[PDB]
Design a protein around this ligand. Structure first.
Ligand code: HEM
Ligand SMILES: C[C@@]1(c2cc(CNC3(C(F)(F)F)CC3)c(F)cc2F)CCSC(N)=N1
Ligand SMILES: [Zn+2]
Ligand SMILES: [Zn+2]
Length: 467
């Protein structure tokens, strides 16, 4: 069939000069309005096809989900300990190694939450700690980001290692600091060039600098896992995912086909830890920013909170079904926030057909989630913070098909159920006890975010006054 259209491919750099790599989603909106919803790019040695709009994204990730659930090879991860039967979940190639870890994580999240509401309990308790840390800042403006990271990080640690850390814990702070630096290393120009040719990593000097913060994070994580292995009681049902992983590792002794080994444990845990730490935190940061930029929205949420929950009783997941406006606001935060504009890259394991065009096997697919969440043909006013995007005239919550912040298909975010819980419980608990506003004397903060692989809000301070 016909290959998708696109700008002129230069002999050497290809289409490297047609992309600014800063505000890339803005550049893709220009290419979409010039070549259509499915266009092509030649980024160096890599053939890339960009998918825009709900239809093009669904056609690849759902209709041809079997052929688009693979990941582009990342050779430099071998420094971190990545192997054939130890690829984790996030970067894992499409196959038995991914599916076993995928099915394990999805089911374990489900089991730890349905049995004794341990999922909901750790979040509820962490929200209370978050409220207290907010309370100590009262009377003075502050950046809420750091505290959001800690509260979000603790929820994960509660699911991985069955514990939380105090906000002033030296090892906790270091773990969080190393994590954020490790995100920046994955957004480096040096990475792409090093991803191209592996034997460049044979140079001792180069190999060391590649992932110095990321190796520090794993090392720090190893120390914590070793401690957790000591306190684990195999005679009891698993308290957390790591224990459940350890119990599987024992059963899989003598089986070289299993992905339940030591090398994969530290990688799967590092995956779950990082992925659900910077995403959920950033969203909560967006949520607070939008509440001080739109106080009228904040009051209506606080109104619905009182009419359903009160101001003393802690919020529960059962309350969400009775709070349609608050649900709309949270969904609109994710939509407007749009923290993962280009999603996570996929790769075709076969030849497929998207929107008539043909996509060769081994092609790197980019799902422009931004083009879906901001689609002007779907949303009433896509470039505004508008809670009524998820409400009808009567006030009922509706969820459009175009709400895809967690992407779609087999590779869709496995953390979504937990994310939904963290977002509702943290957001409601904060607004239940605090009124947020812009600090007087300071400029109105921009609703525009700083573009990266993960779009965070422009740096801002806020005032949190108790109620
Ligand atoms: C607001 C919160 C979150 C958002 C918006 C988000 C978004 C995403 C997106 C766009 C993807 C890529 C899906 C694809 O490749 O098609 C993804 C994958 C993933 N996310 Fe999330 N995520 C969030 C929270 C979390 C949490 C809380 C966890 C874990 C507890 C998590 C763990 C993962 C993992 C492991 C994957 C890879 C799944 C796979 O490759 O099969 N994320 N997420
Ligand atoms: C972007 C992401 C990510 C990675 C790290 C780095 N984690 C490491 C990893 F690269 F090994 F995964 C050092 C331990 C973060 F800190 C934050 C992230 F969102 C998502 C989780 S798994 C992955 N490969 N990349
Ligand atoms: Zn444990
Ligand atoms: Zn209705």
């Amino acid at each position: 069939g016909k290959l998708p259209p696109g700008p002129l491919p230069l002999p050497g750099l290809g289409n490297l000069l047609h992309v600014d790599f800063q505000n890339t989603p803005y550049c893709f909106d220009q290419l979409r309005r010039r070549f259509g919803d499915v266009f092509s790019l030649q980024l160096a040695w890599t053939p890339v096809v960009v998918l825009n709009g709900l239809a093009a994204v669904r056609e690849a990730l759902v209709t041809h989900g079997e052929d688009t659930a693979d990941r582009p090879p990342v050779p430099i991860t071998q420094i971190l300990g990545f192997g054939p039967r130890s690829q984790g979940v996030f970067l894992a190639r499409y196959g038995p190694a991914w599916r076993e870890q995928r099915r394990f994580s999805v089911s374990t999240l489900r089991n730890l939450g349905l049995g004794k509401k341990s999922l909901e309990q750790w979040v509820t308790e962490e929200a209370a700690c978050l409220c207290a840390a907010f309370a100590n800042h009262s009377g003075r403006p502050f950046r809420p980001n750091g505290l959001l990271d800690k509260a979000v990080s603790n929820v994960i640690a509660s699911l991985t290692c069955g514990r939380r850390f105090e906000y002033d814990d030296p090892r906790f702070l270091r773990l969080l600091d190393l994590a954020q630096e490790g995100l920046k290393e994955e957004s480096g120009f040096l990475r792409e060039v090093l991803n191209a040719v592996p034997v460049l990593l044979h140079i001792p000097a180069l190999a060391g600098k590649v992932l110095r913060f990321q190796k520090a994070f794993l090392t720090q994580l190893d120390e914590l896992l070793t401690e957790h292995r000591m306190t684990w009681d195999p005679a009891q049902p698993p308290r957390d995912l790591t224990e459940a992983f350890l119990a599987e590792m024992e059963k899989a002794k003598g089986n070289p086909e299993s992905s339940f080994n030591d090398e994969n444990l530290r990688i799967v845990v590092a995956d779950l830890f990082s992925a659900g730490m910077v995403t959920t935190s950033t969203t909560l940061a967006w949520g607070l920013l939008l509440m001080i930029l739109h106080p009228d929205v904040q009051r209506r949420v606080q109104q619905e909170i009182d009419d359903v929950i009160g101001q003393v009783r802690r919020p529960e997941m059962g309350d969400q079904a009775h709070m349609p406006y608050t649900t709309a606001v949270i969904h609109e935060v994710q939509r407007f926030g749009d923290i993962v504009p280009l999603g996570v890259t996929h790769m075709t394991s076969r030849d497929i057909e998207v929107q008539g065009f043909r996509i060769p096997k081994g092609t790197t697919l980019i799902t422009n989630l931004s083009s879906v969440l901001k689609d002007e043909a779907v949303w009433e006013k896509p470039f505004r913070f508008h809670p009524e995007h998820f409400l009808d005239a009567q006030g009922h919550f509706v969820k459009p098909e175009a709400f895809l912040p967690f992407s779609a298909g087999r590779r869709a975010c496995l953390g979504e159920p937990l994310a939904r819980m963290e977002l509702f419980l943290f957001f409601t608990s904060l607004l239940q006890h605090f009124s947020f506003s812009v600090p007087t004397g300071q400029p109105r903060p921009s609703h525009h975010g700083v573009f990266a692989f993960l779009v965070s809000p422009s740096p801002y301070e806020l005032c949190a006054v108790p109620r």
